[PDB]
C-alpha cells in the first residue's frame, strides 16, 4: 500500500500532449487506513489530479463489489471523453474477492476450489478486460491492481 500510494503521488507521462490523472480505489480498509490515505492525498497536493474511492471494511459488501467498477468507469470517462492518460490503482483485489466470495454462498452456488465462487475467473475478467488505449489514441486506461497472496 505504501508502494501504491507512492506511485499515486509520483506518476506522470513525460514529454505527452495529453493530461494525466490518477484513480485510486481502496477496498475493505480500516478507518485508520482511510484517514491516512485521505491525509496523504490532501497534504501532497496529489489530490488535485486524482479521484479517490474509499471502501471501508464495515461498509456493505455490495458497496465493495461496486468500488472497482466506479473507479474503472471514472477512468474510462476521463480517458475517452477528456482524452487523458489515466492510471488506476486498485488495492486490494484479494479483499474484493473475499467479499464476492462471501455472497456466492448466500447466492445458492456450489462452491469451487478453496471455497471460492465458481464464477471467480469470469467476474474477475470483467475488471481486467477494462484497460488499454482508448479510441482516438489521445487517452488510455492503465491498471496497477494489488494482489496479496492469501496465506502467502
Amino acid at each position: 500500500n505504501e508502494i501504491a500510494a507512492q506511485i499515486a503521488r509520483q506518476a506522470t507521462v513525460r514529454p505527452k500532449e495529453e493530461p494525466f490523472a490518477v484513480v485510486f480505489a481502496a477496498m475493505g480498509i480500516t478507518q485508520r487506513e482511510l484517514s491516512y490515505f485521505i491525509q496523504e492525498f490532501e497534504r501532497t497536493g496529489a489530490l488535485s489530479r486524482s479521484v479517490l474511492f474509499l471502501n471501508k471494511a464495515d461498509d456493505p459488501t455490495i458497496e465493495r463489489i461496486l468500488t472497482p467498477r466506479m473507479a474503472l468507469t471514472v477512468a474510462e470517462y476521463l480517458a475517452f471523453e477528456h482524452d487523458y492518460h489515466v492510471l488506476v490503482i486498485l488495492t486490494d483485489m484479494t479483499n474484493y474477492c473475499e467479499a464476492l466470495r462471501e455472497i456466492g454462498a448466500a447466492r445458492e452456488e456450489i462452491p469451487g476450489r478453496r471455497g471460492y465462487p465458481g464464477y471467480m475467473y469470469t467476474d474477475l475478467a470483467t475488471i481486467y478486460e477494462r484497460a488499454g488505449v482508448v479510441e482516438g489514441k489521445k487517452g488510455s486506461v492503465t491498471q496497477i491492481p494489488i494482489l496479496s497472496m492469501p496465506d502467502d
Partner: protein, 61 residues
C-alpha cells in the same frame, strides 16, 4: 675549510625540511578550501530542493 662545510650542509637540510613543511601547510589549506566549497555547494543545492518542494506544496494547497 672543512667543518664549516658540515655547517653549510646542515643549514640546507634544515631548509629542505622547512620547505617540505610549508609546502604541506598549503596542501592542508588547499584540501581544506576544496572541502568547504564542496561542503557548501551541496548545501546550497539542498535548500533549493527543500524550497522547490515547499512552494509547490503551497501552490497546490
Amino acid at each position: 675549510k672543512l667543518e664549516a662545510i658540515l655547517s653549510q650542509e646542515v643549514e640546507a637540510e634544515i631548509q629542505a625540511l622547512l620547505q617540505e613543511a610549508e609546502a604541506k601547510a598549503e596542501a592542508v589549506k588547499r584540501e581544506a578550501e576544496e572541502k568547504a566549497k564542496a561542503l557548501l555547494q551541496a548545501r546550497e543545492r539542498a535548500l533549493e530542493a527543500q524550497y522547490r518542494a515547499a512552494l509547490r506544496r503551497a501552490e497546490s494547497a
